[PDB]
Amino acid sequence: RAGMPYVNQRWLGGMLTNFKTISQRVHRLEELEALFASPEIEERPKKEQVRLKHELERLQKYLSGFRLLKRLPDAIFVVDPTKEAIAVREARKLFIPVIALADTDSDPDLVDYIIPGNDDAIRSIQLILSRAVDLIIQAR
Amino acid sequence: ARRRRAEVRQLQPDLVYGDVLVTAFINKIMRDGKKNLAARIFYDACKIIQEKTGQEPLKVFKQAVENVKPRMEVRSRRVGGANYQVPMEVSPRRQQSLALRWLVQAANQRPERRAAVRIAHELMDAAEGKGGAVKKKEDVERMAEANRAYAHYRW
Amino acid sequence: KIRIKLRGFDHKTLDASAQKIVEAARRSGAQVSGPIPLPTRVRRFTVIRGPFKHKDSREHFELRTHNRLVDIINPNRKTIEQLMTLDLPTGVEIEIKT
Amino acid sequence: ARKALIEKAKRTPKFKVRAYTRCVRCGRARSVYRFFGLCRICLRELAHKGQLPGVRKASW
Amino acid sequence: EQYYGTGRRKEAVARVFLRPGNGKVTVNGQDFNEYFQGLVRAVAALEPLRAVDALGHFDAYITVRGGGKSGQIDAIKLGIARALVQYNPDYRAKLKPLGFLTRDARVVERKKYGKHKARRAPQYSKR
Amino acid sequence: GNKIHPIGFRLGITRDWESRWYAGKKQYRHLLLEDQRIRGLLEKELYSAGLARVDIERAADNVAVTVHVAKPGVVIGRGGERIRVLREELAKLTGKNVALNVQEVQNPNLSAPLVAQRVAEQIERRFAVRRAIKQAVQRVMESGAKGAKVIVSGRIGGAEQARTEWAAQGRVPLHTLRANIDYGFALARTTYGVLGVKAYIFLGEV
RNA sequence: UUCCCGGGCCUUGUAC
RNA sequence: CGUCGUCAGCUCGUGCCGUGAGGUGUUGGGUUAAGUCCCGCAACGAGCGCAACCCCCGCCGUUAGUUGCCAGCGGUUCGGCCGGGCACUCUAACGGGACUGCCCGCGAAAGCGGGAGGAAGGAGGGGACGACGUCUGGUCAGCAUGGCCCUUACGGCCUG
Ligand SMILES: [Zn+2]
Secondary structure, eight states, X not given: OOSOOOOOSOOOTTTTTTHXXXXXXXXXXXXXXXXXXXXXXXXXXXXXXXXXXXXXXXHHHHHTTGGGOSXXXXXXXXXXXXXXXXXXXXXXXXXXXXXXXXXXXXXXXXXXXXXXXXXXXXXXXXXXXXXXHHHHHHTO | OOSSOOOOOOOOOOSSSOOHHHHHHHHHHXXXXXXXXXXXXXXXXXXXXXXXXXXXXXXXXXXXHHHSOOOEEEEOOEETTEEOOEEEEOOHHHHHHHHXXXXXXXXXXXXXXXXXXXXXXXXXXXXXXXXXXXXXXXXXXXXXXXXXXXXXXXX | OBEEEEEESOHHHHHHHHHHHXXXXXXXXXXXXXXXXXXXXXXXXXXXXXXXXXXXXXXXXXXXXXXXXXXXXXXOHXXXXXXXXXXXXXXXXXXXXX | OOHHHHHHTXXXXXXXXXXXXXXXXXXXXXXXXXXXTBOHHHHHHHHHHTOSTTEEEOOO | OOEEEOOEETTEEEEXXXXXXXXXXXXXXXXXXXXXXXXXXGGGGSHHHHHTTOSSSEEEEEEEXXXXXXXXXXXXXXXXXXXXXXXXXXXXXXXXXXXXXXXXOOOOOOOOTTSSSTTOOOOOOOO | OXXXXXXXXXXXXXXXXXXXXXXOTTXXXXXXXXXXXXXXXXXXXXXXXXXXXXXXXXXXXXXXXXXXXXXXXXHHOTTSOHHHHHHHHHHHHSOSOOOOEEXXXXXXXXXXXXXXXXXXXXXXXXXXXHHHHXXXXXXXXHSOOSEEEEEEOXXXXXXXXXXXXXXXXXXXXXXXXXXXXEEEEEEEEETTEEEEEEEEEEXXXX
């Protein structure tokens, strides 16, 4: 419910420091997605089609949402700064400001803009994220 | 085998009797892949049984089968370069295997000139409880249960 | 009443030649029997891959000949002149027998 | 596979039975086939190089 | 009127023709029993008949070619199965579970170079 | 080891026979012998021209020879005289009115035999082996050529011990049938013996 | 899968 | 060309760690015939590998019926023998079909157990295919070639 990308399955190690390599996978996913919707699929007998289906499914699961990033982002929003410490390190290394919904077991110093709250309790995340996205939409 | 369980092949039941034990028996009689000859031998033998002994030879065959069916077997074990003929339980499949095997070898062992008469005599005697196959079964049984001290080697 | 023999090593060019002949004949008036496929003949050569020893190598090669039949019925004169004129592919071999 | 041996096989040897077959490429006389007139090694090489019309790797 | 089935097993091919009648079977213009004379497995051909309370309704004309006697019988079996299926589809519901509508597809394996016959390696000793 | 011929593996599909004609058992041997003789003569002569392939066709008591050359200028000559004598040669060798034809290969960097003879000549001229191989593979890679691989046999730089060099880049799927991998072998003769060079080039699929 | 033979991978002591 | 061995392994690009040699990837849990696949994991991929693409066998269909075949017709000196017909087998070419595809249940997933439809059911059965390399492996007597050696002889021709 916004133009902003997201990562919600598993943070692949090196989405930022190795952005080009992951962009290669983005391109690959684009090419597959184009191919399956093309009238040239009558070649490549059924079994190879099934293999390509598996490949496409995997890339769709993992790389969905990330596809929107045509280049490096402008900021990062993380639910848990500790669970996603790798993303925090990458953002720090590439001078990308960090927004975190931290808790009692987090490091405040590693986040530029910190929201002291909860990481469990679905209600809390719902409220915070809803407010944030509403502020995003309103300011466009 | 290291992974699988080696599924048992399901034999096609015999035509005249509609039985699988008969098929297994005739298969065990087989040599050089001559099915027709083995079946002819079996049929002649059962006809001889019918003439000599009043009742149907199917029942006498089966009765001999569970007569010559053992329960204990001794198996070798290699611990510190020594032999340990531990007794062990036999599954019904294994029971059937050795039963049929002993029956056939004993049939071939008789001094009668014709094969059919040999197998018929062995069958009737094994049904009664005398002959080579029976004596061998009590042989293996007495070899078993005589070294019960080795039973701790569960294996 | 005229039988047309097609022999080849490559089945594709043989089929193309047979198709050309049948089409040309069919255009030229009278009907034809149609392409009759015949059992291909196979020659086999087993060799030793090694130049000196290891007689357990034994690579295989095959040479197969494909056959056709046309059997044009009710010959027409202009049909006849239509034959022996159409240039055949290089690989294909032709034979005519009444 | 001496040269002299190569030319010795190309003359009528006064009788039929003395005549035999030599490889037309290397002069071997041990594994020559009537159909091609080549030894097994030369046959294999030429088959692999694709210089034999219709001859192909067999598998069935 | 023609109830037809193919039947193929181990290189043997059959052609079966069932028609209403008193239950007379003939192969190659000869009696069944005479043709497979002495073969204990002959009766292994027509249990597809007795499975469906046939053997009293159908006269059979069989033309069978290729393979050996056992293959002959198996081809006949599959042929009659297919013909009975062609007669009335419902029979399938009671034929398939018994294993009569499957085409057995095990043939002679190709003899392989380096082996005596396709599996058996030449004996070697004194390692 | 002991990889098979990449061409012989694909005779059925993606590759085609060099010789295209039919003959019975009665006259197979004679045609094959004369074809071999023709190929020998042509390879001996036109080496300077940069020979690629020799196609032999027969239709009816006649031969249609097609020659793939890097530079047709050498073969044809100043006003088409050379070919004439060449024709005569073949006409003298086998008296069945042969019809010589010349075809020029587009972008000679994408023909394995040409790369092979080039590298062989480099070796014969006492070049540095490794550097030459890297240069060759890079040159092949520049002109599309989805894969390139070059192997040199042994006896590098007149050494006492033979050794394979080998170098490749791109995709070279030798195991896939639908590969269309072009193959070329050349032999180089030097003061210290013979060297073998192999070149594989991978061009698309299907 | 205890043992006989032949392999693969992961673990530990003394030399290049 | 043989063998390790049709064993499953051998590497690279970019990014991360360490001052550096280097490491990660390629380890751990599980599962496969497999570095096959899933999850976890500072790594994401790629190349040679495996698998697939190719051939044969197994089911069906469309073109094609002579030297192949003979179900329903008419003769037959009763043997497809003739007249006759491509229904069937076959013969070849082009395709369809098998994909854990559907259902029940068990698992976080790869998957597992059991069913149905099918000729075939969980790499359907074989073939061709041999990775980086090891073995100073084999072959100068298939051939090609470096260096030595002989050239009234170690060359060549006949009989035994
Ligand atoms: Zn030769």
